[PDB]
């Protein structure tokens, strides 16, 4: 009930948020990039994932 709203909010996408279009280098940089405060939790981005 509550977790399922947590994940839905975590994996949506706005249209123009902080740090859009930049390209990341994996799950580990995508996290800390958001913790520091630059990029928004749902902003369109290009990552590399194995």
């Amino acid at each position: 009930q509550d977790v399922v709203l947590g994940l839905y909010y975590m994996t949506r996408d706005c249209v123009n948020a902080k740090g859009e279009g930049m390209v990341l280098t994996g799950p580990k940089e995508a996290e800390r990039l958001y913790r520091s405060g630059l990029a928004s939790l749902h902003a369109r981005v290009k990552v590399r994932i194995t």
Binding site: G19, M22, V23, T25, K28, E29, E31, R32, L33, R35, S36, L38, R48
Partner: protein, 226 residues
């Protein structure tokens, strides 16, 4: 009036380490977990490449001939380069490679001011008949993290077209995330047990990173304590 300091500070090794610590006073779990975590992620002196000079190409949505990946992917290979320098404060490497095959990072020049820590870190796969890859990469010390988006916006170091800029991560950490969980001192159930879990990009071992982060933090509190 007279507080509790932690004993049984266990440390685990598996560039990856999962420190622990306990028993901290109640509510001191987070005020330590978040002070450190905001230092390793925000401000920490380090060195990382910042710009690249493709020897022939003047735009990222262009394409280099003979190179397998495109420059949008190549810069992804340079953004993760692990470099440490003892003496200098701005050094511009030179990689001018030929041959055919996986162009590793050990083909870079070897100057007395730099010392790579991941030479087999691949940068590009070269096709046949070309053997024509050269670039001038610029590493400069700094603190924290600074994207390339907010540099060119205030572009003050005017560069003609084709002076490629990369996202610079100066901090020696790659991820850090603490986790608090209850613990007791055999008579009190209001205690804590911090659990730090930290990684780094080779240039600094993990426990060495936490050491010189509690140092930067206990320096700011110098003009207050007795």
């Amino acid at each position: 009036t007279e507080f509790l300091k932690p004993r049984l500070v266990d440390i685990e090794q598996v560039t990856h380490a999962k420190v622990t610590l306990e028993p901290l006073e109640r509510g001191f779990g987070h005020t330590l977990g978040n002070a450190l975590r905001r230092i390793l992620l925000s401000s920490m002196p380090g060195c990382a490449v910042t710009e690249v000079e493709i020897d022939g190409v003047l735009h990222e949505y262009s394409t280099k001939e003979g190179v397998q990946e495109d420059i949008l992917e190549i810069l992804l290979n340079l953004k993760g380069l692990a470099v440490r320098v003892q003496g200098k404060d701005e050094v511009i490497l030179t990689l001018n490679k030929s041959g055919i095959g996986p162009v590793t990072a050990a083909d870079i020049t070897h100057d007395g001011d730099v010392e790579i820590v991941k030479p087999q870190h691949v940068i590009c796969h070269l096709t046949d008949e070309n053997a024509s890859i050269s670039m001038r990469i610029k590493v400069q010390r700094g603190r924290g993290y600074v994207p390339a988006s907010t540099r060119i916006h205030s572009e003050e170091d005017e560069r003609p077209i084709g002076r490629l800029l990369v996202d610079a991560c100066y901090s020696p950490v790659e991820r850090i995330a603490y986790n608090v969980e209850a613990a007791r001192v055999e008579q009190r159930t209001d205690l804590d047990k911090l659990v730090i879990e930290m990684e780094t990009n080779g240039t600094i071992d993990p426990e060495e990173a936490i050491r010189r982060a509690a140092t930067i933090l206990a320096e700011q509190l110098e003009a207050f304590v007795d």
